[PDB]
């Protein structure tokens, strides 16, 4: 087996050349050039209203592109469609399985999707002019648990999995249009580009890797973390993204500069991150910890821009509206409180 | 204001009808005690008019460290084990024991020698089968007594109709949680 090992040695010498290219672009840091800027200061957000009515732990949330409606999962098997302004439960959908890991809302504003531990991505319909809410189709193509769903449109929807495969689904047929491989872990979360062309997904392998949807190939793989990556969120311009981790660190990576820009961590923090998200401009990084609070970070100076400690029990998924008007945090205590 | 009042008059009935539906469903939800077994999958059934919603993990991969944190609302973690299956089962029982979230969740064990030199060093408190199964039983007790968590305790069983045995054991779990809720135990 000499040729296999020497071919792995050539793979090692040019990946060493890859590391040499990474040092080649490493001329400065983010903190040095962003040293001469004025931070936001202590910024205060208080709970404007709380949404009550879940019977068990809320595992997910997804906003709407109209910024009005928000969809929340739960442990009990009820995905409840909420109105944020008038705090009224607009819809309530009984799920087929009890455990659901994620929910999505259509950018058209016409469909919702549950993704659960039952290995099924199920799509529900809202625009039924006859009557109530139904199942349009359920999707079945993994041998592992579902972790996070996102929509491209009303017709093709992208799902990650714990079957090590991000996949692209089409609703008209119920089959995988393409299947993304290259990971070696549970694919935890994924976020689309703002022009919806490409998406990046975290994993178990401490490795968040960009994916091209047409090509179905591992474009580039960012490895700077220490344990499994829990949730990532894409930067609003389309050129960077920030990753949560398990070593209490947030890292923002650049797609073009191909390496770490900053590390958001304190030694006093030893708790794993559950979800991160950017604001509208991208200045603020809203990171929800297991210390039952979400810290607010400046994107450019790596300080606690604010501390947001409303919740009783830990968070599951926080989100920012598309206009940037309000931030809502789900939690494990059956109550999600919108913030502003 | 006719659009605003018609919108609110829509949400009046929609909120009251949906919150009323949830109020009806919540009493049914609390009436279910969920059990997780490791060792289509979901099964809910009746024992003495008690609803048990049970989940099988056979449709998952070997990696376990991030779908088991979804189960911190379960009442009991069943282990169906057998005979090197044993030592990795002791690894797994220790791994779920010392977990930061699952310190409150109890565990029920079921069973349904050349790796151990301690096997011959055992004293019994087929006799070879008897000394073997009580050696394994005490061996599992070694992790619980070694940790000393105090909130959850391992409940071993055997075979040679398990559902009445796990119902009565679950009754013990409910009594200990409800009793210690009054800061008594």
């Amino acid at each position, epitope marked *: 087996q000499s040729e296999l090992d020497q071919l792995r040695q050539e793979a090692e010498q040019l990946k060493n050349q890859i590391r040499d290219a990474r040092k080649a672009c490493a001329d400065a840091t983010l903190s040095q050039i962003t040293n001469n800027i004025d931070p936001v200061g202590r910024i205060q957000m208080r709970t404007r209203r709380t949404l009550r009515g879940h019977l068990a732990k809320i595992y997910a949330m997804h906003w709407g592109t109209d910024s009005r409606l928000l969809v929340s999962a739960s442990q009990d098997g009820k995905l409840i469609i909420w109105d944020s302004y008038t705090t009224n439960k607009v819809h309530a959908i009984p799920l087929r399985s009890s455990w659901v890991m994620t929910c999505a809302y259509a950018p058209s504003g016409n469909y919702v999707a549950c993704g659960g531990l039952d290995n099924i991505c199920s799509i529900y319909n809202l625009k039924t002019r006859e009557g109530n809410v139904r199942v349009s189709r359920e999707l079945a193509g993994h041998t592992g648990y579902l972790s996070c769903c996102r929509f491209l449109d009303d017709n093709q929807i992208v799902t990650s999995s714990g079957d*090590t495969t991000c996949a692209l689904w089409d609703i008209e047929t119920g089959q995988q249009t393409t299947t993304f491989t290259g990971h*070696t*872990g549970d694919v935890m979360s994924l976020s689309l580009a703002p022009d919806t062309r490409l998406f990046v997904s975290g994993a*178990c*392998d*401490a490795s968040a890797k960009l994916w091209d949807v047409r090509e179905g190939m591992c474009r580039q793989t960012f*490895t*700077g*973390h*220490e*344990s*499994d990556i829990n949730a990532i969120c894409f930067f609003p311009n389309g050129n960077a993204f920030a990753t949560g981790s*398990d*070593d*209490a660190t947030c890292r923002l990576f650049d797609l073009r500069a191909d390496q770490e820009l900053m590390t958001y961590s304190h030694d006093n923090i*030893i708790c*794993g991150i559950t979800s991160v998200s950017f604001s509208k401009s991208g200045r603020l990084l809203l990171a929800g910890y297991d210390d039952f609070n979400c810290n607010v970070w400046d994107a450019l100076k790596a300080d606690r821009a604010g501390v947001l400690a409303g919740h009783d029990n830990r968070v599951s998924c926080l989100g920012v509206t598309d206009d940037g008007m309000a931030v809502a945090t789900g939690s494990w205590d059956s109550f999600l409180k919108i913030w502003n | 204001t006719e659009d605003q009042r018609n919108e609110e008059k829509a949400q009046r009935e929609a909120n009251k009808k949906i919150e009323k539906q949830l109020q009806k469903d919540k009493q049914v939800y609390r009436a279910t005690h969920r059990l997780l077994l490791l060792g289509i999958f979901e099964t809910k059934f009746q024992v003495d008019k008690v609803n048990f919603h049970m989940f099988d993990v056979g449709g998952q*991969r*070997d*990696e*376990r*460290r991030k779908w088991i944190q979804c189960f911190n609302d379960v009442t009991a973690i069943i282990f169906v084990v057998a005979s*090197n299956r044993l*030592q*990795e089962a002791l*690894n797994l029982f*220790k*791994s*779920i*024991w*010392n*977990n*930061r979230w699952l310190r409150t969740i109890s565990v029920i064990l079921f069973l349904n020698e*050349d*790796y*151990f*030199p*301690e*096997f011959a060093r055992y004293t019994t408190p087929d006799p070879r089968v008897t000394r073997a199964k009580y050696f394994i039983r005490d061996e599992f007790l070694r992790i619980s007594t070694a940790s000393g968590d105090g909130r959850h305790y391992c409940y071993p069983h055997f075979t040679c109709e398990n559902i009445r045995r796990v119902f009565n054991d679950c009754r013990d779990i409910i009594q200990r949680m409800h009793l210690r809720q009054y800061e008594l135990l």
Partner: nanobody, 128 residues
Framework: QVQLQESGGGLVQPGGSLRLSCAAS????????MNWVRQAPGKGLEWVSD????????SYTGSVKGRFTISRDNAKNTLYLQMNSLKPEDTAVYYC?????????????????????RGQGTQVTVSS
């Protein structure tokens, strides 16, 4: 990038003794928990032995009890295993494995497939 590389291994006689040295690279080694796992010939992965974060608390498999010993050096950023009166059945691929969580007491790393945080495995083989 968390890459684990382990030197040592090779051929040992029955009754021989040998040292396996695992080097840890790309992570803050002082925080985590280490363990060694075997791949038996034509069998699944089997857990052997672990250490605490300080190195004070060590567990073993029953078969490796009294004969094998493991110790970490955080300054040397490494883990060692030493054999004492080795047994000819032990012909195995030994992997140096990291527990996934910082500041923890539990590990989930006996999985045969697709666990990331492990080495490549010194083909520790015993002669006749």
């Amino acid at each position: 990038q968390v890459q684990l590389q382990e030197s040592g291994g090779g051929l040992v006689q029955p009754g021989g003794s040998l040292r396996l040295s695992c080097a840890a690279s790309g992570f803050t080694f002082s925080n985590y928990k280490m363990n060694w796992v075997r791949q038996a010939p034509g069998k699944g992965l089997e857990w052997v032995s672990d250490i605490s974060q300080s190195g004070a608390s060590i567990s073993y498999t029953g078969s490796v009890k009294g004969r094998f010993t493991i110790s970490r050096d955080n300054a040397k950023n490494t883990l060692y295993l030493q054999m004492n009166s080795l047994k000819p059945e032990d012909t195995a691929v030994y992997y140096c494995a990291r527990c996934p969580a910082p500041f923890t007491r539990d590990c989930f790393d006996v999985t045969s497939t697709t666990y990331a945080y492990r080495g490549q495995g010194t083909q520790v083989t015993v002669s006749s």
